[PDB]
């Protein structure tokens, strides 16, 4: 791990932020509907597939793409209060003359973040599966060659997974994962071997929905893998029993053979 | 023999003429001691028994009953007859005595103060022998045949463990990890046996008429599997290469390590090159077994040459190990003979066998 090397590696300062974002009046209301809508109660009674519902939910608290509603197009920013967070987050930043690095479990959901960027006059380069993979390392080595290019769209699925992103400096997880792997490879993009600037992880949540509930997953998942990777001393996910209620909204307010009989017996008393 | 001390002490010989001259007299004029007993603890047969490897002075022995006798083989009585009383044993009354068949145990090398047993209860319990109290159990989905520790791994202390799965399974008494498994037998693993040589070479033998040796390090399968012609009847292996036309349910490497010895069910015993699995084309003639289970036979160590000690029936049959020649028949009990065990300090052969009796050969005069 990086901290059996980190004094003899000097990596810069690492931070990770969560921000448990609130949902915005509209995003509220189309919440609250689909979670009492008949399809969600229909789900819960198990007559078919749990993933549906949990597409719509995930998609509900990432933007109202469930509907959409001159300035109200389609993916617009103050619709959503996770796009109102980034949008405050991308105006301190690009006030800092800093390197940001946004990243979308989806990939639509980051056709409509790219086109907020146009919105703004931030300068982006957006990179997921569809991106040829031939202009690939180019469209990296671009982005890490000049600071130029302001923030940069990703997909965790190609945005992770071996790519070096030393350029940018800010790091935000927009959208959670059933699997914790895929926001740590995405955070760690940034901080790896010649990161020679301080960076944050931020991870945007909505609280009370459906995305912390996930978080509640991917938390127990990393616990899980640090009983079996880092030490298997780790505390037991006390906050939550993990039971499909996840439809809820309830937002903010030689060994000489002694040694071997005693490991023996250590083991077995247990 | 005059001659040997008068050699031995003027130097004409190495003394250690001498003492492998000697100690092979001593072999070939193994007779039933009359003059030594050990005493009747089991009341089904024994399967197994084990000498110690530091001072010889223990036996253990697992009944069909399912107890462990742990005997004392030094005559501490000041007698010429004595019989070798039994220290402790892992009685009908014991909480963690076996179910069922005690098929193996094993004196932990390098150290008397543990030693292991499997049975067919499907457990391998490992024991604390001063307190004789399990310090561990690795239970098996399936019956065990055979287990066997590496007489020489100061680095690993890994059992492997045949069981009628056909799967040969690795467990590590260093942190118990019962897990790893070798893979490429197909029906039950009779036999199983570390090289005396090679800290990480086990060769186990299977009902499949098959024997492989592996390289437990290795992550790649067998290195070799024994095959009787060595190749004149070649075929693509799938179902060639069987060491023997039967059951192959017993292995020995010999002394130093560089040969192996199996027996199966096709009434031959064959010498085998443990470097390439070469077969060495030794005849041993008939070699009556038709044990269903392990059968257990020793080699002879420290002597000018090598014998074999093999379980024929009611008998012990001598062979010498590199020519052949069948030393003598030992005849002294009364139903098959499961087991002998050699006692390599003074060229004793313990045997146990289905009448409940373990039978001393001790050398005449």
């Known amino acids: 791990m990086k901290s059996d090397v980190k004094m003899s590696l000097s990596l810069p300062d690492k931070n990770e932020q969560v921000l448990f974002c609130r949902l915005t009046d509209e995003q509220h209301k189309v919440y609250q509907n689909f979670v009492d809508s008949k399809e969600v109660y229909r789900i819960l009674n198990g007559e078919m597939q749990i993933f549906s519902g949990l597409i719509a939910l995930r998609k509900i608290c990432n933007h109202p793409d469930l509907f959409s509603g001159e300035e109200d197009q389609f993916g617009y920013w ?40 146009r919105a703004q006059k931030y300068t982006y380069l957006k990179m997921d599966g569809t991106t040829t993979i031939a202009s690939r390392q180019p469209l990296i080595t671009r982005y890490n060659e000049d600071t130029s290019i302001f923030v940069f769209l990703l ?106 009989l005693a490991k023996m017996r250590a083991r077995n008393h247990l | ?198 800290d990480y070479i086990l060769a186990t033998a299977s009902a499949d008429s098959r024997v492989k040796l592996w390289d437990v390090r290795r992550a790649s399968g067998c290195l070799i599997t024994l095959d009787q012609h060595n190749g004149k009847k070649s075929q693509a292996v799938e179902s060639a290469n069987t060491a023997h036309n039967g059951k192959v349910n017993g292995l020995c490497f010999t002394s130093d390590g560089l040969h192996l010895l199996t027996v199966g069910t096709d009434n031959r015993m064959r010498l085998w090159n443990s470097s390439n699995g070469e077969n060495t084309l030794v005849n041993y003639g008939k070699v009556c077994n038709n044990s269903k289970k392990g059968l257990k036979f020793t080699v002879s160590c420290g002597c000018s040459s090598e014998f074999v000690f093999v379980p024929y029936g009611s008998t012990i049959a001598v062979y010498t190990v590199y020519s052949g020649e069948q030393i003598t028949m030992l005849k002294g009990h009364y139903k098959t003979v499961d087991c002998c065990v050699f006692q390599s300090n003074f060229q004793e052969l313990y045997s146990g066998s289905r009448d409940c009796n373990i039978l001393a050969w001790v050398p005449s005069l």
């Open chain 2, 1 to 198: 023999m005059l001659g040997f001390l008068s050699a031995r002490q003027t130097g004409l010989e190495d003394p250690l003429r001498l003492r492998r001259a000697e100690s092979t007299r001593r072999v070939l004029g193994l007779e039933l001691n009359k003059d030594r007993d050990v005493e009747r603890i089991h009341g089904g047969g024994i399967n197994t028994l084990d000498i110690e490897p530091v001072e010889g002075r223990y036996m253990l022995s697992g009944g069909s009953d399912g107890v462990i006798v742990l005997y004392d083989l030094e005559n501490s009585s000041r007698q010429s007859y004595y019989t070798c009383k039994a220290v402790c044993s892992i009685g009908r009354d014991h909480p963690d005595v076996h179910r069922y068949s005690v098929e193996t145990v094993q004196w932990y090398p390098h150290d008397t103060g543990m030693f292991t047993s499997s049975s067919f209860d499907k457990t391998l319990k490992v024991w604390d022998t001063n307190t004789l109290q399990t310090a561990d159990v690795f239970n098996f989905e399936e019956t065990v045949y055979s287990h066997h520790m590496s007489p020489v791994s100061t680095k690993h202390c890994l059992v492997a463990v045949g069981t009628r799965g056909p799967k040969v399974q690795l467990c590590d008494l260093k942190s118990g990890s019962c897990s790893h498994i070798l893979q490429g037998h197909r029906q039950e693993i009779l036999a199983v046996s570390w090289s005396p040589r090679y």
């Open chain 1, 78 to 117: 103050k619709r959503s209060g996770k796009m109102i967070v980034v949008e405050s987050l991308l105006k301190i930043w690009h006030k800092q003359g800093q390197r940001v690095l946004l990243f979308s479990q989806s990939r639509q959901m980051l056709d409509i973040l790219e086109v907020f960027l």
């Open chain 1, 155 to 260: 997909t965790t699925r190609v945005g992770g997974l071996g790519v070096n992103l030393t350029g940018a400096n800010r790091v935000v997880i927009y959208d959670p994962d059933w699997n914790p792997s895929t926001d740590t490879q995405a955070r760690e993009r940034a901080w790896r071997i010649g990161q020679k600037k301080q960076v944050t992880v931020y991870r945007l949540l909505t609280a009370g929905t459906i995305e912390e509930k996930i978080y509640h997953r991917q938390i127990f998942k990393q616990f899980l893998t640090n009983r079996v990777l880092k030490d298997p001393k780790q505390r037991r996910f006390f906050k939550s029993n993990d039971l499909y209620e996840l439809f809820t909204l309830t937002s903010p307010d030689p060994l000489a053979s002694s040694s071997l």
